[PDB]
Design a protein around this ligand. Structure first.
Ligand code: HEM
Ligand code: HEM
Lengths: 362, 362
């Protein structure tokens, strides 16, 4: 029904994966640190209400007739829907408010990768809010109302809707398929794996940036699939690209989805072989991405793909080595990375008096 | 997760309970071969029978010849039917092909220009449409993708629109959904149980003049942008006055409950409900079946938001046109703009397993 908002960690990372996403990047328009802090406090108060299924402020109706309602009202009658709201800070935020020396070293700028075709308008951003819920209207309402509360101090830079499974009809334990028709998420860090999260996802105090202890680092990549090209490939070609079969999702030479892969049986440039921790010095990621389908482009092709989200303890030892290793991935023929952003996701809101970013702003 | 029967005197997807998600595609025809088009309609019908029962198209998604592309693209494997309906319509432009000129229904009227229109011609019209509705977005995208694939070389996608959530109701026993302005939308519609009202207002009859269309309907689609910045600064009273219903309960002004009958004289003369009500339009009544959308940001710092308005009626000339003409003075016009338009003739149902989409026309 609901996911607790308070914790040592922000929710929406290790908590169960909800069916829908609305991810928004924002740019900050104010130069006034005090004004920004005030906004973070107001947003935290709103997030507390939103995640409990309550309207922001004094509500969506029943206030002064001559005043705009505090909540825009489109989630009235809906359930909390496991809403989580996760905030992150982009590198560009640290050029404001005297913060330059508090940028974490683990918040690294990404290199240019072969085949990148990044749209600058759907890249970057000073901050992000990841809204995940089982009902997309609950997520959209959250973003719309945060944006409204922030008007005059922040603007929306770019926005992405996404979907995974539909939980009402699909068992929780079934791996979702991506839009290439392959199971996606078999070998991942699970939110149950507390030690793996400590090793590979959460920032530790000894890593170098005390304010980020209990936070994580997020890489977002908007990855278009060339759907119509992929659908013309043979079944063999598709399986060869991944190193798993399409029906069961077993590694080649194995029988079951969850059988551990034998990498040498896969083609050298198969995706799974290149991305596996054993191929990358042990580098391991929490993937928490969502499929997207935005419509059709000017050529009549499906604008669809994977809005890839990865959480890690350090960008330099998580996404960067793994993505570097995908330079020769057979999958590259059928995908293009068209948007990118990185964010430092701070620690959790500890209790009712705490607020997003309090460890940074003080 | 249940299936909706595909066969019937009417196509499903009209009077059917409104499903959570939409994927609407308009296609243009690129073949001049009548036989080839008929063959496509039959292949599409066969595919639709599989898709709406939760089965893969053709010989399946895997287990075929390794050297051939799979017949089904595979991303719906393991998913329930999810109330998928597939509804086909034919646009006016179709009737310039295949010797069909004389068979264009009079009720398939071109819309006049309405004040305030700003129609994008690229995202308007279309020789044909497929409306895919389901409770699972993946199921809906799969259906459209596989239809388009089957149609390669004979049809191209002209434009598409995804709807993330419904803003309509054919089931008054169930909660009425809210649009992105925060109001309940669908209270006074036509219910799927109201057989007499469907015959009067929605289904084409033989006596209407076009025998091939008996049991079909006519569809108007309007893509409507919402000026949410403008709306969100309006007072509660202004918002409620725009509609003639309160925001919280959605009761007619003065009254206590949603489903109490409107008393039109208590509404402002330019209130939406007052101008749209059948009693204000010589009895004209529509079946509204639209969905909300958001397609990113608008590039000016704000979320994009709108409503993909769909209405079914027995005759465009006696349904949508009178009512929209009467909305020329609507208070709602301050907050919306129509930016895409199409009309379609939705043929009768597929009677049984030997029938096919468009068989009464061809
Ligand atoms: C559209 C783009 C992509 C698609 C369709 C895709 C698909 C898949 C699939 C089907 C699997 C196998 C099942 C599983 O274990 O999840 C997989 C595994 C994986 N992918 Fe990707 N992927 C994409 C992009 C990326 C990117 C950008 C990265 C990282 C930079 C990445 C990292 C991984 C990792 C780490 C694994 C697990 C390997 C293992 O430990 O076995 N993927 N992906
Ligand atoms: C973004 C655009 C629109 C919004 C936000 C909107 C909103 C609403 C709302 C809140 C209601 C009251 C509840 C209900 O009975 O459904 C309503 C009713 C209605 N609307 Fe709209 N509407 C829009 C566009 C249109 C258009 C374009 C038409 C027709 C051309 C239309 C026709 C109707 C009708 C027929 C009713 C029911 C009136 C009655 O019989 O009581 N609407 N609309």
């Amino acid at each position: 029904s609901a996911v607790p908002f308070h914790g040592a960690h922000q929710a929406g990372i290790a908590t169960p994966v909800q069916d829908r996403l609305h991810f928004a990047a924002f740019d900050v328009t104010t130069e006034d640190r005090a004004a920004f802090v005030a906004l973070l406090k107001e947003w935290t108060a709103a997030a507390r209400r939103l995640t409990a299924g309550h309207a922001v402020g004094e509500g969506a109706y029943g206030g002064l007739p001559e005043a705009p309602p505090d909540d825009t009202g489109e989630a009235l009658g809906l359930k909390p829907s496991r809403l989580t709201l996760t905030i992150g800070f982009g590198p560009s935020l640290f050029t404001r408010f005297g913060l330059a020396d508090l940028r974490p070293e683990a918040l690294a700028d990404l290199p240019k990768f072969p085949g990148d075709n990044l749209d600058r308008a759907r890249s970057g951003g000073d901050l992000c809010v990841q809204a995940c819920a089982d009902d997309p209207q609950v997520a959209v309402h959250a973003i719309r109302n945060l944006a409204r509360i922030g008007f005059g101090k922040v603007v929306v830079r770019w926005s992405q809707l996404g979907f995974g499974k539909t939980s009402s009809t699909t068992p929780d334990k079934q791996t979702p398929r991506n839009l290439l028709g392959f199971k996606d998420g078999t070998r991942n860090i699970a939110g149950t794996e507390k030690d793996r999260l400590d090793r590979f996802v959460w920032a530790a105090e000894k890593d170098g940036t005390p304010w980020m202890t209990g936070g994580s680092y997020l890489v977002a990549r908007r990855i278009r699939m060339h759907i119509e090209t992929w659908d013309r490939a043979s079944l063999q070609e598709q399986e060869d690209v991944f190193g798993r079969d399409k029906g069961e999702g077993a590694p080649v030479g194995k029988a079951k989805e969850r059988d551990e892969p034998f990498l040498k049986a896969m083609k050298p440039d198969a995706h799974v072989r290149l991305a596996h921790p054993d191929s990358n010095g042990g580098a391991t990621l929490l993937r928490r991405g969502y499929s997207f389908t935005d419509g059709t482009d000017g050529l009549g092709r499906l604008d669809a793909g994977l809005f890839f989200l990865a959480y890690q303890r350090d960008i330099r030892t998580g996404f960067v080595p793994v993505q570097r290793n995908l330079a020769t991935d057979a999958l590259n023929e059928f995908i293009q990375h068209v948007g990118s952003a990185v964010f430092a996701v701070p620690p959790g809101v500890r209790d009712a008096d705490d607020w997003w970013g309090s460890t940074l702003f003080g």
